[PDB]
């Protein structure tokens, strides 16, 4: 019952003819799956460890110049020569300074001058790369029925942790009283590692784009260096001064840590103090409900009295969780829980904690249910001692549908075509929508890559105006539709 | 001459004593006594709260975090009064005499 | 404008419009930096911690 507290919780209801459902386990989001006659399960992606990343490129963010030297030639005598020019760790530049009799030359003109200073690196930002091979996810599956505590079992916990690495596609988790859940996850397509750099500057690490990382204008080493002195592109971290065309000087151009922090705007930070832990990105899995059994089936109904040990609480997703304790005979029995209307003539509310049961006499099992909008009754127990607890659900139905549509749009924005594999059970509409989304998303990524959200909004407004003014209505509708989607993406981007 | 500093800018800061205070949902924003200390930088946000977190209500709980801001390096912007400029000029007669 | 070991002659409005923490210049103690938020970042991912 982890998902209760999480604001980003999605309810996936239904399984295919084969009793499988595919889901996307995003980081920081909890998924709860409800299937008829099936235990309700809570899936959370809690970790993404990338192991043994190989260094790709070292960048210099803070250098220091030393051993500065200068050589001059009299005018018309070519360029001077510095022995330090042969060495590649000296940054050198050629310029011309006015010469004459006063400065020791027999000709009045511009003589060549060369300034060389030894370039040294104080701080560098390694950028490492991982191959999907050593990309190990971690998922927690918690049987959503029971009581939500991690101290019930000394050896472990009620929830199970399964590590989804690319080596094994099938990961099978055995729940103590619920059978086994099978996840056929696909780690290779979750996040496009090997098109992505694990940038690590000092004690902070990010997850940057490989092309962006390789386009950074800083001194860099290949990444396989051992001496670590032959920096490439040194002149990006050095200034040469020839102020009055009289002498030339070279300065080190300060430290680039803060500028790099500003540059990393828009990159999701990660952890590298131990193991290169990533807490971002999604994962696509298929659920195997076939071997999942309800924990408390083949119990007799509880006929005793029930008391509410915890006041009914309205969870953020429109459900209610109530903790009740059983005081009656027949310890291991199944709780009679119902949600009806004010006349007690209909069962209006659905039960998220399907098949609530009393495992132990003195154990406060907690129940999550979805009541209907408006006034209702939460009834627990049989008629002698049955609890009627009135509830009012604050919202409306149409508002909930609007919210669900907006949530689906936000999923289509955060995720790519995977938004079509979040709730799908196969089917031609899902497949066709996914294919069309793939085509339009390829076109949109080609068109809008590397553009800020402000530019996306500007382009959306421009396209909307063009469509609004188009004389052909087919083109007009298409253009306004594209512009509206572009505006929405601009508003929702910068997540 | 006689430049007077008008402003010091911090170019390399440091955060040392981080403290945080959390409030349960529908109870408003929390309070830190460091929040009205001027040498502390603070920010208010909302974190998910619930039974696991220890609240008893399900919603967004106000959160505040504060760290002490310390400057390790600064850049002094100085100003000079126009009366304090002293230009130096050299007048050499183009005579042809040697040193 | 004197930074660490180097100095520049800069416009005064440009200098007063820089996005960095600043003391008024008469503060010997340096315990009241202004605009401290331009040199720190507050991160709240997943709405779980800050």
């Amino acid at each position: 019952m982890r998902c209760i507290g999480i604001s980003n919780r999605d309810f996936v209801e239904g399984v295919s003819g084969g009793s499988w459902v595919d889901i996307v386990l995003e980081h920081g989001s909890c998924v709860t799956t409800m299937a008829k006659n099936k235990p309700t399960l809570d899936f959370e992606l809690i970790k993404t460890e990338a192991k043994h990343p190989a260094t790709l490129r070292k960048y210099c963010i803070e250098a220091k110049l030393t051993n500065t030297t200068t050589a001059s030639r009299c005018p018309t005598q070519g360029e001077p020569s510095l022995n330090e020019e042969q060495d590649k760790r000296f940054v050198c530049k050629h310029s011309m300074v006015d010469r004459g009799w006063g400065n020791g030359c027999g000709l009045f003109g511009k003589g060549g001058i060369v300034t060389c200073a030894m370039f040294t690196c104080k701080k560098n930002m390694e950028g490492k790369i991982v191959q999907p091979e050593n990309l190990e996810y971690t998922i927690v599956i918690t049987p959503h029925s029971g009581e939500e505590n991690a101290v019930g079992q000394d050896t472990g916990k009620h929830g199970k942790e399964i590590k989804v690495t690319p080596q094994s596609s099938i990961t099978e988790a055995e729940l103590t009283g619920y059978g086994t859940v099978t996840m056929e996850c696909s780690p290779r397509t979750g996040l496009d590692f090997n098109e992505m750099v694990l940038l690590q500057m000092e004690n902070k690490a990010w997850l940057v784009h490989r092309q962006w990382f390789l386009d950074l204008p800083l001194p860099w080493l290949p990444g396989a260096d051992t001496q670590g002195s032959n920096w490439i592109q040194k002149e990006t971290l050095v200034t040469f001064k020839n102020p009055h065309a009289k002498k030339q000087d070279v300065v080190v151009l300060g430290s680039q840590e803060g500028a790099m922090h500003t540059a990393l705007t828009g990159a999701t930070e990660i952890q590298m103090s131990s193991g290169n832990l990533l807490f971002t990105g999604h994962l696509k899995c298929r659920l195997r409900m076939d071997k999942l059994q309800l924990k408390g089936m083949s119990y007799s109904m509880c006929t005793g009295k029930f008391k509410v040990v915890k006041e009914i609480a309205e969870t953020q997703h429109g459900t209610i969780v109530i903790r009740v304790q059983y005081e009656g005979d027949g310890s291991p029995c199944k709780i009679p829980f119902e949600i009806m209307d004010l006349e007690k003539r209909h069962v209006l509310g659905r039960l998220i904690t399907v098949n609530p049961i009393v495992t132990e006499k003195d154990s406060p099992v907690n129940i999550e249910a979805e009541p209907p909008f408006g006034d209702s009754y939460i009834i627990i127990g049989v008629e002698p001692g049955q609890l009627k607890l009135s509830w009012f659900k604050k919202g409306s139905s149409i508002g909930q549908m609007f919210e669900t549509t907006m949530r689906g749009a936000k999923r289509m924005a955060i995720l790519g075509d995977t938004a079509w594999d979040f709730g799908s059970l196969g089917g031609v509409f899902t497949s066709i929508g996914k294919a069309l989304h793939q085509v339009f998303g390829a076109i949109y990524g080609a068109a809008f890559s590397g553009v800020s959200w402000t530019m996306k909004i500007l382009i959306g407004v421009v396209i909307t105006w063009i469509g609004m003014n188009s004389r052909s209505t087919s083109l007009s509708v298409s253009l306004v539709l594209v512009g509206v989607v572009t505006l929405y993406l601009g508003v929702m981007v910068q997540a | 001459k006689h430049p007077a500093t008008l402003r010091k800018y911090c170019i390399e800061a440091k955060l040392t004593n981080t403290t945080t205070a959390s409030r349960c949902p529908t109870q408003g924003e929390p309070s830190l006594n460091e929040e009205q200390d001027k040498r502390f930088v603070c920010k208010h946000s909302m974190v998910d709260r619930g039974w696991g977190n220890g609240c008893g209500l399900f919603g967004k709980g106000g959160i505040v975090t504060c760290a002490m801001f310390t400057c390790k390096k600064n850049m002094e912007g100085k100003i000079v009064q126009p009366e304090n400029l002293e230009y130096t000029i050299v007048i050499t007669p183009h005579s042809g005499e040697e040193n | 404008l004197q930074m660490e070991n180097k100095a520049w002659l800069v416009h005064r409005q440009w200098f007063l419009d820089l996005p960095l923490p600043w003391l008024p210049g008469a503060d010997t103690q340096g315990s009241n930096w202004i605009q401290k938020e331009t040199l720190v970042t507050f991160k709240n991912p997943h709405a779980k911690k800050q």
Partner: antibody, heavy 126, light 111 residues
């Protein structure tokens, strides 16, 4: 289940440096965060602070935030609490407890059973 | 910080009866957060967690121990006092500032 064994009682002169280890077995050390509780003989339990074994993050009490330092070994499977400036008030038995951190290694909010397991106790008479 | 947790210094009850221990604290820790935990400490023994939540208790602990919290006060209720209930009981809470406050402690003595 899980077991935590603290060190033997130490009698020290006031002002000396104290260091008492609490090796905890039966569970992933870096998974849980280990707290330190002090109780003067004949007085209440008194919370010093916690050290997270996952990443070394620590928190000390207002009272102890100057002379009290907590460090742990991930490999040695032990966490150490050291008191800097000893005093007669500091003559108490110091108890090490444990609380599990979240799935992300952070220790923002504790588990409701935040002191489910303790140590037998180490007595220091300053 | 400070022992905001204030509970009766001395408590006694006849064997077999029901005795309650009340722990009071500020609205920061015990009035706002359900982290009220009750710990029993025997002579020369380390504290043992009795109720980790306001009312929840560990597997080992018997069901005679039941807690409650109303307003800023937390109450430990023991039903059917035995001769093995003569230990001290320390309430604790997770303060809103992230610290831990223990109660003064109640020494239970049975007649």
């Amino acid at each position: 289940e899980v077991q935590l064994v603290e060190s033997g009682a130490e009698v020290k002169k006031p002002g000396a440096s104290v260091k008492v280890s609490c090796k905890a077995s039966g569970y992933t050390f870096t998974s849980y965060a280990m707290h330190w509780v002090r109780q003067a003989p004949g007085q209440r339990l008194e919370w010093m602070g916690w050290i997270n074994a996952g990443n070394g993050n620590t928190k000390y009490s207002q009272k102890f935030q100057d002379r009290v330092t907590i460090t742990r070994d991930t490999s040695a499977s032990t966490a150490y609490m050291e008191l800097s400036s000893l005093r007669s008030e500091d003559t108490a038995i110091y108890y090490c407890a444990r609380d599990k951190v979240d799935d992300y290694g952070d220790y923002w909010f504790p588990t409701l059973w935040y002191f489910d397991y303790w140590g037998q106790g180490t007595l220091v008479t300053v | 910080s400070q022992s905001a947790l204030t509970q009766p210094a001395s408590v006694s009850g006849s064997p077999g009866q029901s005795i309650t221990i009340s722990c009071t604290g500020t609205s920061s820790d015990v009035g706002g957060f359900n982290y009220v935990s009750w710990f029993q400490q025997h002579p020369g023994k380390a504290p043992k967690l009795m109720l980790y939540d306001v009312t929840s208790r560990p597997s080992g602990v018997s069901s005679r121990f039941s807690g409650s919290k109303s307003g800023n006060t937390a109450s430990l209720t023991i039903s059917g006092l035995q001769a093995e209930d003569e230990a001290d009981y320390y309430c604790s809470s997770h303060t809103s500032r992230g610290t831990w406050v223990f109660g003064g402690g109640t020494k239970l003595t049975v007649l």
